[PDB]
């Protein structure tokens, strides 16, 4: 059958970003707690990720930056003002106790999943803890400290000729796209909202440079895209990318901040529309890796990721929520699926058609494998 390895750690749920900070890593804990109660863990291999040492993290990040990260503590905050100015650690990414432990857990989960997937032991590896994709080579940004998507991809490149990275988070995956902007071995496809949104990159004309020309794909979207439009723009573009690029592994960043009703995201996707993307990607029968990242309405994130892990196992799950430790958090409807909002779709048919045709014209110039 299909083997799925799930990487969870019981300590990653005890890290606090700060007072009123949007990113609460505790959302992972009830994501696991839903998994333990739906009975999905019966058909899943559960592993505990090791703590990746600083040597594993230096493959992409500069050594001084990681030395700062492992040396910075809140109790000696004032002693590294120049470092915080240089390394962009501060209001964006607050210093909290266990910062380096959290980074180690995330990157260890991603790298261990990449190694296990790289030995042909398993076909789908699920690591909701990691997925941080905004951190640059030598500076943190967007609540992301250590870029673990790029480390996981670099681990996959040791055996796979071409690795395709698929993004569905509302924001542009600027860290990983920057990391592989001049490489023809990794094709990064990102669906995001353009305009004033963070980080204000990923224009339609950003198609890489050097050897990586036409090997980076960006799909700029607008406010309030619905399930039907998202599916109708995801399926054909993905089909063309897989037909032209012909990858050997897929790394999917199942960002859950594109859902309807987040604290930060302004899309209109429901849980079914979000899981349809993962189901479509999973059907191509490629060594596939799923990571989380993003998502800031915690209950919606837990529901979405429980469904994502349910669709990975091809297991149908009841719509009602069984009693668990966090039952009171999901009230008062007490249902797994979430209804869409009344937001007006600003993605007109002509806009999507023109963008898709432009992307198709760009993809035709990609050399044959």
């Amino acid at each position: 059958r299909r083997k799925v390895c799930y990487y969870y750690d019981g300590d990653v749920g005890n890290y606090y970003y700060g007072q009123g900070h949007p990113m609460k890593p505790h959302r992972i804990r009830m994501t696991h707690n839903l998994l333990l109660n739906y009975g999905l863990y019966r058909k899943m291999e559960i592993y505990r990720p090791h703590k990746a040492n600083a040597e594993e993290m230096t493959k992409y990040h500069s050594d001084d930056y990681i030395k700062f990260l492992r040396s910075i503590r809140p109790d000696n905050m004032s002693e590294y003002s120049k470092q915080m100015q240089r390394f962009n650690v501060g209001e964006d990414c607050p210093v909290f106790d266990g910062l380096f432990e959290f980074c180690q857990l995330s990157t260890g989960g991603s790298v261990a999943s990449a190694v296990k997937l790289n030995k042909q032991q398993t076909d789908i590896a699920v690591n909701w803890a990691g997925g941080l994709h905004h951190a640059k080579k030598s500076e943190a940004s967007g609540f992301c400290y250590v870029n673990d998507i790029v480390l996981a991809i670099l681990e996959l490149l040791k055996y796979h000729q071409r690795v395709l990275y698929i993004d569905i988070d509302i924001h542009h995956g600027d860290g990983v796209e920057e990391a592989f902007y001049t490489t023809d071995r990794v094709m990064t496809v990102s669906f995001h909202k353009y305009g004033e949104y963070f980080p204000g990159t990923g224009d339609l004309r950003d198609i890489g440079a050097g050897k990586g020309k036409y090997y980076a794909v960006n799909y700029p979207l607008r406010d309030g895209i619905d399930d039907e439009s998202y599916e109708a723009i995801f399926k054909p573009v993905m089909s063309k990318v897989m037909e032209m690029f012909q990858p050997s592994a897929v790394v999917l960043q199942c960002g859950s901040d594109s859902l309807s009703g987040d604290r930060l995201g302004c899309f209109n996707l429901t849980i079914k529309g979000h899981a349809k993307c993962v189901e479509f990607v999973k059907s191509f029968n490629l060594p596939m890796l799923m990571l989380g990242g993003g998502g800031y309405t915690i209950r919606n994130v837990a529901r979405c990721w429980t469904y994502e892990t349910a669709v990975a196992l091809d297991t149908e799950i009841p719509n009602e929520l069984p009693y668990n430790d966090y039952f009171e958090y999901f009230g008062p409807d007490f249902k797994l699926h979430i209804s869409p909002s009344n937001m007006t779709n600003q993605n007109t048919n002509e806009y999507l058609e023109k963008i898709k045709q432009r992307l198709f014209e760009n993809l035709r110039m990609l050399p044959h494998a």
């Binding site: 007072q19 949007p22 209001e91 930060l264 302004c266 909002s341 007006t344």
Partner: protein
């Protein structure tokens, strides 16, 4: 036109013909007093007027001149329902279009222009009367508007008398007013603190014999409402990095006292006060997206839909007419000005995008006026990639969703604060200058200011509350909290007591 050729045959329309005709008529009628053909006598003074322009300007004069009576054919016509000064002012308006309106004779001009069917002057006199209404003559203006069937002025007088119902209790004209007027002012919704029950019982007790039958109808038509003279203050303490939201309640004694105080764990980029609710935007900001709504009763925080785009120093304008909150202009995190306009539906908790602005501004002052949003000042986009202080006026019509920049320019530029009072926009800029902006006539009237403001060049925040204009100081000294009330009728300034809040920095003052 397809059938017209500019070399053989075409039509010619002159765009300056109306102005030329008007100027020629004014010059020939006033300067030389030529071609006079009808004589009007008012209080013994003889006016030589032209029947053509009078008949073209007003319907009453046309009707009187076209009649078959001998008086219409008579050279001299007498008028006894007007005075000399008022009729002279009317003739000045008819022949020139420029009239000097004074408060002493506004009632007379309002009555006479209604009699002579001068529509524009009647409308302007109605607006001036609606501005000038106070607690002293609210019921007299009620009577006047009801007599002349003016809905706007009647509504303004009703709003002014309803909110001061307790003070009107011991006046003869309140006891003598008919039942319908009292029913109208009561059914509009009296605030709870005014005690409408006392008003009803006193009105009944004035003449019990002839008025008892209306008790049940008055009680059935009675409707009551609660308190919203709130002025919201958002500030940051010197020793704290979080935000404090203080809501002040204004008393009839002109003392301002704190009714509540809230603390928010996030920085705030913009804020607006919609109805009685306070909305703030701020997200630990390289990310201005989150919004929170505070209700006075709950003393808590409720998160609303995030912004469709994250912009710095945008203007949040509350539009109660459409039940929407508008975000206009603002900088981007890349220091590029943005001209996007987005409005938030309070009922549906859904954002939407509308037509962009003509000129991108950041940090402007937004004022809502009868459903039209004015963007005052800000910072334009200088051609050489930088930004400069701006003075242009932008008008956004929410009903039509069409924006256009006014050809006029403000006396000053830079950052400014706008407070809407009655039918005017009061704008306070740097350098202790106060400007009263009338958008209908599109003219400015600078208000004199006491020399005590010249000690420091600090910015001033302006807020309007229950018909009074309050001017606040942005920077508060330790133990020195000065709030200046302004009387726009006489340009007087009065210091207000009772305010003691440890707000070193007043970020936003909301009316």
């Amino acid at each position: 036109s397809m059938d017209e050729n500019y070399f053989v045959n075409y039509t010619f329309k002159d765009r300056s013909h109306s102005g030329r005709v008007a100027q020629g008529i004014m010059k020939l009628c006033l300067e030389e007093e030529l071609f006079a053909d009808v004589t009007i006598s008012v209080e013994g003074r003889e006016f030589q007027l032209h029947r053509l322009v009078l008949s073209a300007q007003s319907c009453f004069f046309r009707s009187m001149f076209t009649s078959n009576l001998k008086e219409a054919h008579n050279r001299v016509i007498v008028l006894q329902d007007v005075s000399e000064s008022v009729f002279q002012l009317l003739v000045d308006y008819i022949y020139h279009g420029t009239v000097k309106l004074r408060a002493e004779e506004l009632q007379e001009i309002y009555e006479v222009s209604d009699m002579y069917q001068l529509t524009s002057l009647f409308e302007e006199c109605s607006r001036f009367l609606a501005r000038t209404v106070q607690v002293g003559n609210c019921l007299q203006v009620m009577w006047l508007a009801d007599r002349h069937s003016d809905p706007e002025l009647y509504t303004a007088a009703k709003h002014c008398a309803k909110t001061h119902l307790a003070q009107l209790q011991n006046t003869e004209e309140f006891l003598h007013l008919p039942h319908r007027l009292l029913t109208d002012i009561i059914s509009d919704g009296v605030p709870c603190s005014q005690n409408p029950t006392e008003a009803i019982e006193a009105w009944i007790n004035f003449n019990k014999e002839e008025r008892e039958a209306f008790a049940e109808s008055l009680r059935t038509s009675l409707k009551e409402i609660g308190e919203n003279v709130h002025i919201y203050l958002i500030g940051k303490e010197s020793s704290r990095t979080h935000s404090l939201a203080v809501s002040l309640h204004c008393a009839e004694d002109d003392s301002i006292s704190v009714s509540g105080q809230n603390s928010l764990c996030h920085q705030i980029t913009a804020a607006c006060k919609h109805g009685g609710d306070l909305y703030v935007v701020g997200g630990s900001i390289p990310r201005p997206r989150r919004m929170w709504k505070c209700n006075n009763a709950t003393v808590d925080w409720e998160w609303c839909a995030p912004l469709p785009r994250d912009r710095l120093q945008h203007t949040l304008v509350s539009v109660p007419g459409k039940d929407a909150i508008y975000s206009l202009g603002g900088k981007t995190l890349q220091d590029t000005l943005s001209n996007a306009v987005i409005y938030y539906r309070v009922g549906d908790n859904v954002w939407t995008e509308t037509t962009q602005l003509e000129v991108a501004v950041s940090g402007a002052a937004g004022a809502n006026l009868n459903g039209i949003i004015y963007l005052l000042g800000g910072e334009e986009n200088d051609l050489d990639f930088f930004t400069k202080p701006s003075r242009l006026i932008q008008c956004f019509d929410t009903e039509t969703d069409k924006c256009h920049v006014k050809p006029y320019v403000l006396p000053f530029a830079g950052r400014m604060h706008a407070a809407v009072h009655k039918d005017l926009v009061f704008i306070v800029a740097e350098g202790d200058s106060l400007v009263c902006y009338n958008p209908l006539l599109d003219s400015f009237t600078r208000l004199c200011l006491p020399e005590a403001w010249s000690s420091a060049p600090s910015l001033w925040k302006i807020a309007s509350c229950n018909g009074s204009i309050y001017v606040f100081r942005d920077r508060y000294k330790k133990g020195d909290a000065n709030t200046y009330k302004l009387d726009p009728a006489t340009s007087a300034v009065t210091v207000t007591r009772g305010i003691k809040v440890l707000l070193t920095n007043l970020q936003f003052v909301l009316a």
